Design a protein around this ligand. Structure first.
Ligand code: SF4
Ligand code: SF4
Ligand code: SF4
Ligand code: SF4
Ligand code: FES
Ligand code: FES
Ligand code: FES
Lengths: 152, 665, 152
């Protein structure tokens, strides 16, 4: 509990008295802590003297911020136009029914997390199912097990 | 040409150049369906219902946001616009769960008025029956989110008008919900000043005042009386709705004034609740622990016998209310200050008024107005709350402070011996210890103006020297600072002069005068001073065997004054209600006109006279208040001689601007 | 929740109508599930028609049963006579203050668990600090970090 009060109070120091900078001030506490706890946003609102409602609105308005602890291995499937026309939706729904967890949430013990992203760039090797480390070019319906057990 | 001429629905319209089409529309007569435009709040373009078409241009543009350009043909009513507006209303009804059968606002809802106007006998779009939370944790406000059109008129009225920026939007797209701080409940919120301006801005029954639900509807009102709140000095303008002899809803007019209709809790929640109190309407008598009904002759006899046996030996006083009009206070002066010549008459806040008007008086000698209007703390750069808690003294001043220090880039610095009134909004906190800290502050300000030292004044003030120099630096660096004198600054009247003199020091001059803006607890302050306020404090520190206390039982009364009243041995209260802190310390308990059955004028510290209007007429027959004063004058050896209301001539006049000197004490 | 009702109801089948066998009947649900949930003991008491109090007493009487989910990597330090005379207590207390968790409990997110055991056999290479896979012969005060970060 005390580990989350000065790390956030120190990353705000180079922004005091400067207009703007809540989008970056959070992208840093996200990269450090993995997520944005309520204590984090509370101290950001205290230090910047910005309203807590505004901080929570910006923290929940953008996709790449996670207010709850994200997993230790993200399972970003590509729901881009190229993957979807190829049938990535099938891969997404099977990783859904396989981890048994809801669409955009973490496992019960913080091991995996499903995060449907935009194009990861491999719009040639479609569909791509990145498992937090590297691309995965083909990912037919049967090749999802041989990776989800490996990275855990 | 500023005056442009357009054509809305054939009807020719006239407007200023920068005005939007909705402004030139509402200016002449014509009606355009709107749901998210609150007169005041900057046009937010969310509902997309005000869409109008320009001739030739085949597309449609919002009338709230698109400006009026020098001559053009606007069509507001036709088939395609009616179709699109009906589709928008139906989308709102299908997305959120709208049940009008049980809504507090079924008759006021602006989504319901529009739906009936556009003959919405259906929903067309599939009903998404999703579960939006009903936040009724707050005992005063309830937020039933399944009626929320998402117009942001509640975020905007709590961001730009109240300042205590409690409400904002939560998520994006469809999941967008209006939330309190960190997505918590309104009760759990630390930053809600419980104002209700969110309930006056909500068109769609999401936010409702709970206590007056189903009664505070504007469609079922018997009358609508405009007046002034009498609870504090700001004197907010109100639009009280009357339904069968009670006020059911108090919405604040003045959306064009700097305040913006954000009446406080005491005005949107104590004014309608006071029209439903016990209301004695018959002269009582103590009898021991429980009152008995007496006649007016019997009660005034038992209250005048105790006023003659206690006036020969001096032993007599009067604690009138400063929420009373100048007519009533002039009547009380006719009996108490002139007929029987009591020098023990006070006004239930006499310490505050006499401290303020004995600290400001030096500058009246020097010939300046040592106070300005509170709406000038909105454009200031550094706000200094000296001994003030504006949330409990004049909450619109606190809202101005918040709007300034959040949406207009100000800084807060407190010089109080208290809880730092805005805990998390001040940049430098000072906690001046008790004792005698006024002439050392005088020396400090004499420095701050003459040098442009603090070492001796620091230890003299009982303060650390580093922070005492930071105070001077941030005080000189400001380009238009303002000071907020508190009521607690008036226990020693020289502290108020120290505050005003610090304002002269910090180059704080406004067109009305000095930037100190005293937080008067009462509205009729100058009226009370010229008629009742005693030049010496007597309450508590003097016995006062008899005490006639007049208490329009509205504002919470200082508890020291109540104790002093409880040790009096005969207390004649003329309170209108039977509220708790007055029926305990009372022996007679006569009735009164109760603030809404009388009219008055309320001359204030800032000069000009206001007007309180008779909202609902009296029900019973107290038959006068002059009758009580006459029956006191009778069998006491004195007369009455009703005088005229003393013309309030603003004792503090601004014959000097940006040219004052400090005052030695 | 339904995953823990038939697996325990099937391992009890070869013990029905046989006197004894609650110590083994549990060592099997421990090896399978990693721990003994309350549902597990409840179904054992239902199937064997043995009292629930007796089942809980046997489950909490012996050390190698864990009624709460054990971690994914045990950190068994040896508090045997040979290691203790060598000073294994120092290693134990530093893994204690380093994971910050209590003496015989799991981490807050089920990554590690400290389980002071008896002799793991390497009474020659003392002290031994097994990290759920292999022995560790020397384990001076400084060599505890280079393994606790590796296995996580
Ligand atoms: S908010 Fe208005 S439209 Fe919605 S249910 Fe209530 S009265 Fe009807
Ligand atoms: S009560 Fe006042 S401060 Fe609170 S949310 Fe409503 S408008 Fe804002
Ligand atoms: S709560 Fe009311 S005022 Fe606020 S956004 Fe919703 S509908 Fe508009
Ligand atoms: S701030 Fe004062 S004048 Fe305004 S509504 Fe509240 S009590 Fe009335
Ligand atoms: S299409 Fe999925 S990677 Fe761009
Ligand atoms: S009414 Fe013009 S957009 Fe809301
Ligand atoms: S002494 Fe620790 S291994 Fe036997």
């Amino acid at each position: 509990t005390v580990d989350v009060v000065e790390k956030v109070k120190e990353i705000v120091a180079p922004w005091k008295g400067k207009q703007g900078g809540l989008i970056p001030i959070l992208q840093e506490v996200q990269r450090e802590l993995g997520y944005l706890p309520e204590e984090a946003l509370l101290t950001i609102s205290r230090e910047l003297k910005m309203p807590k409602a505004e901080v929570y609105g910006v923290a929940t308005f953008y996709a790449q911020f996670h207010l709850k602890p994200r997993g230790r291995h993200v399972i970003r499937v590509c729901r881009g136009t190229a993957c979807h026309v190829r049938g990535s939706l099938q891969i997404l729904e099977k990783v859904k029914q396989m981890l048994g967890i809801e669409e955009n949430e973490t496992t019960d013990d913080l091991r995996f997390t499903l995060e449907p992203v935009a194009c990861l760039g491999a719009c040639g090797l479609a569909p791509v199912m990145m498992v937090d480390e590297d691309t995965h070019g083909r990912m037919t319906p049967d090749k999802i097990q041989a990776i989800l057990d490996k990275y855990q | 040409m500023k005056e442009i001429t357009l054509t809305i629905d054939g009807k020719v319209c006239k407007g200023v150049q920068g005005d939007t089409i909705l402004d030139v529309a509402n200016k002449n007569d014509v009606y355009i369906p709107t749901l998210c435009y609150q007169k005041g709040l900057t046009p937010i373009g969310a509902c997309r219902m005000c869409v109008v078409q320009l001739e030739g241009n085949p597309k449609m543009l919002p009338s709230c946001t698109t400006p009026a350009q020098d001559g053009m043909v606007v069509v507001t009513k036709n088939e395609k616009l009616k179709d699109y507006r009906r589709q928008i209303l139906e989308l709102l009804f299908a997305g959120r769960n709208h049940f009008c059968m049980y809504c507090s606002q079924s008759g006021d809802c602006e989504l319901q008025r529009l739906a009936i106007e556009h003959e919405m006998d259906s929903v067309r779009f599939p009903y998404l029956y999703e579960d939006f939370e009903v936040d009724a944790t707050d005992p005063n406000l309830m937020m039933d989110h399944n009626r929320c059109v998402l117009c942001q008129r509640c975020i905007r009225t709590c961001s730009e008008i109240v300042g205590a920026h409690t409400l904002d939007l939560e998520r994006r797209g469809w999941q967008a919900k209006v939330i309190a701080d960190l997505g918590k409940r309104l009760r759990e919120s630390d930053t809600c000043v419980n104002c209700g301006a969110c309930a006056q801005s909500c068109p769609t029954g999401t936010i409702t005042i709970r206590e007056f639900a189903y009664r505070g509807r504007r469609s079922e009102c018997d009358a609508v009386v405009e007046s002034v709140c009498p609870l504090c000095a700001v004197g907010c303008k109100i639009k009280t709705y009357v339904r069968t002899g009670s006020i059911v809803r108090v919405e604040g007019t003045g959306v064009e004034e700097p305040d913006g209709g954000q009446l406080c809790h005491m005005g949107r929640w104590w004014l309608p609740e006071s029209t439903e109190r016990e209301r004695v309407t018959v002269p009582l008598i103590r009898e021991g622990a429980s009152y008995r009904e007496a006649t007016w002759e019997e009660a005034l006899a038992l209250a005048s016998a105790e006023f003659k046996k206690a006036y020969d030996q001096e032993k007599a006083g009067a604690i009138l209310s400063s929420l009373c009009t100048d007519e009533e206070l002039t009547l009380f002066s006719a009996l108490f200050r002139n007929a029987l010549k009591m020098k023990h008459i006070d006004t239930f806040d006499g310490d505050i008024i006499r401290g303020f008007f004995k600290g400001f008086m030096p500058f009246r000698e020097q010939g300046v107005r040592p106070f300005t209007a509170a709406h000038h703390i909105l454009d200031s750069d550094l706000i200094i709350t000296m001994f003030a808690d504006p949330q409990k003294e004049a909450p619109v001043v606190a809202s101005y402070i918040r709007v300034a220090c959040l949406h207009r880039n100000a800084k807060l610095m407190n010089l109080s011996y208290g809880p730092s009134p805005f805990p998390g909004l001040v940049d430098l906190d000072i906690r001046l210890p008790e004792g005698q800290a006024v002439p050392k502050a005088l020396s400090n300000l004499a420095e701050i103006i003459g040098k442009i030292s603090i070492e001796e004044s620091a230890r003299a003030m009982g303060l650390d020297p580093k922070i005492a120099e930071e105070v001077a630096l941030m005080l000189i660096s400001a380009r238009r600072p303002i000071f907020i004198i508190g009521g607690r600054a008036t226990k020693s009247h020289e502290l108020v002069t120290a505050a005003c003199n610090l304002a002269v020091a910090s180059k704080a001059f406004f067109e009305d005068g000095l930037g100190v803006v005293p937080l008067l607890v009462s509205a009729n302050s100058l009226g009370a001073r010229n008629t009742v306020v005693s030049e010496n404090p007597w309450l508590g520190r003097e016995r006062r065997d008899f005490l006639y206390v007049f208490s329009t039982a509205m504002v919470p009364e200082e508890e020291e004054i109540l104790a002093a009243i409880s040790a009096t041995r005969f207390v004649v209260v003329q309170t209108p209600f039977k509220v708790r802190p007055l029926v305990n310390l009372a022996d007679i308990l006569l009735p009164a006109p109760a603030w809404y059955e009388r009219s008055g004028h309320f001359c204030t510290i800032e000069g000009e006279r206001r007007k309180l209007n008779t909202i609902v007429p009296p029900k019973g027959e107290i038959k006068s208040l002059h009758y009580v004063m006459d029956e006191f004058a009778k069998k006491l050896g004195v007369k009455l001689e009703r005088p005229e209301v003393s013309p309030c001539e603003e004792i503090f006049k601004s014959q000097l601007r940006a040219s004052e000197a400090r005052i030695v004490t």
